[PDB]
Ligand binder design. Structure first.
Ligand SMILES: O=C(O)/C(=C/C1CC1)Oc1cccc(C(=O)O)c1O
Length: 418
């Protein structure tokens, strides 16, 4: 059957993460698990893959890689290829780099060749885990048998975590901050977010770390993946974009930090962001469809606003994502200038950090979550990355401390490789 009853006492995050580890290894496949609105979707197995790089677009199907050059907007390029996958299957999953959002500002020339912009795939099988049920899509006996074996076994106990020191500043985050402050004071831009990488000196178990962290984090969206040599996990603090089948587009910028409601620094910054999103959404919206619906409402508690619109017929979901990308929250104000500065003052390319993780539907749906509070493994390297907004009054030591706080979303929950 399509449906299985959820076992009592079992958290959905825990079960989906267990499925992700056990079932995929069994059948030799890559995966992405995405948490959206009480559903944990495990997209298992790469049926077809879209790789969009700075200098090339690749579609790999059935063992055949078909390479194309592309020009113009990255979203249009990505959209066309993804649309093709979605004729064949219902949903597509992936990640989008920070670097995806640089073309709109004409910064693409800065990118080295073979710089990844996006990886989007359609799954061989889907498993959806929620509180009530497990739903199976395109699951063969092999997958089905595996889910069945796990379900019987139950979830593994999470081992004790292993600590890491975040006090070093090898990349000189503090000095880099100062430089930003000077540029701000000189009126180059209002804001930039700068970040630092922290290497983790041991290998971690990604699914087990994801479970431990999820227990102590309540995020807007979350993810765990093994894709194309990359392991990653994260607790996304913001939604970049949600586009519905009906054409309604949403973005929800959050303020961060009683005194949230009254504090001036936040309010000015949140308002400026709200203005930015509204302006961006407007370019892709039916005239007169754009509104801010829940302004500066308190929603951990956060300040946030909901910006909504109707996707114009001339435009599409990728265009909406490009209009809103990268998020102000991890870039700067004004955006073009903040992004420019990031090439200069931060370690580039960013890749997954400050990019998005995406779920797309054949119905026209898009869900894109901002990648922050995440861990990465590529090659032999395991790392964490956190950053801070920098404005004219910012202090390098305080900003360093801020990074440490953000790192603490993950630093206590690292489970070493098994
Ligand atoms: O500014 C904040 O507190 C913030 C707000 C989010 C919207 C709710 O979170 C972040 C902003 C920028 C960078 C990071 C980071 O982890 O790298 C970050 O977590």
């Amino acid at each position: 059957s399509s449906s299985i009853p959820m076992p009592a006492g079992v958290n959905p995050a825990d079960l989906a993460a267990e499925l992700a580890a056990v079932v995929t290894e069994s059948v030799d496949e890559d995966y992405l698990l995405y948490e959206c609105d009480g559903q944990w979707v495990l997209a298992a197995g790469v049926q077809a893959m879209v790789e969009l790089d700075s200098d090339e677009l690749r579609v790999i199907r059935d063992g055949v890689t078909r390479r194309q050059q592309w020009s113009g907007r990255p979203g249009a390029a990505l959209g066309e290829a993804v649309d093709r996958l979605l004729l064949e299957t219902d949903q597509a999953f992936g990640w989008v780099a920070f670097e995806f959002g640089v073309h709109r500002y004409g910064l693409q020339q800065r990118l080295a060749p073979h710089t990844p912009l996006a990886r989007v795939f359609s799954p061989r099988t889907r498993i959806m885990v929620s509180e009530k049920e497990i739903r199976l899509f395109d699951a063969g006996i092999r997958h089905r048998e595996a889910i069945d074996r796990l379900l019987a076994t139950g979830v593994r106990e999470v081992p004790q975590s292993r600590s890491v020191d975040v006090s070093d500043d090898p990349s000189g985050f503090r000095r880099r901050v100062a430089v930003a402050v000077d540029e701000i004071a000189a009126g180059r831009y209002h804001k930039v977010i700068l970040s630092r990488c922290v290497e983790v000196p041991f290998a971690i178990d990604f699914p087990l770390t994801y479970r431990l962290g999820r227990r102590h984090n309540t995020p807007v969206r979350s993810f765990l993946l093994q894709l194309g040599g990359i392991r990653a996990l994260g607790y996304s603090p913001e939604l970049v974009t949600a586009v519905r089948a009906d054409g309604v587009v949403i973005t929800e910028p959050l303020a961060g930090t009683d005194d949230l409601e009254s504090n001036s620094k936040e309010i000015v910054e949140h308002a400026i962001s709200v203005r930015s999103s509204l302006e961006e959404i407007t370019d892709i919206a039916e005239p007169g469809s754009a509104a801010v619906i829940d302004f500066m409402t308190v929603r951990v508690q956060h300040l946030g606003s909901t910006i909504r619109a109707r996707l114009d017929p001339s435009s599409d979901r990728m265009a909406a994502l490009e209009a809103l990308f990268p998020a102000v929250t991890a870039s700067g104000i004004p955006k073009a200038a903040g992004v420019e500065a990031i090439f200069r003052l931060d370690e580039c390319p960013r890749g997954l950090y400050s990019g998005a993780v995406v779920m797309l539907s054949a119905d026209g749906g898009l869900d894109a979550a901002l990648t922050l509070r995440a861990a990465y493994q590529v090659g032999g390297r395991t790392w964490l990355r956190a950053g801070a907004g920098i404005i004219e009054e910012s202090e390098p030591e305080r900003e360093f401390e801020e990074t440490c706080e953000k790192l603490s979303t993950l630093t206590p929950y690292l489970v070493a490789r098994q």
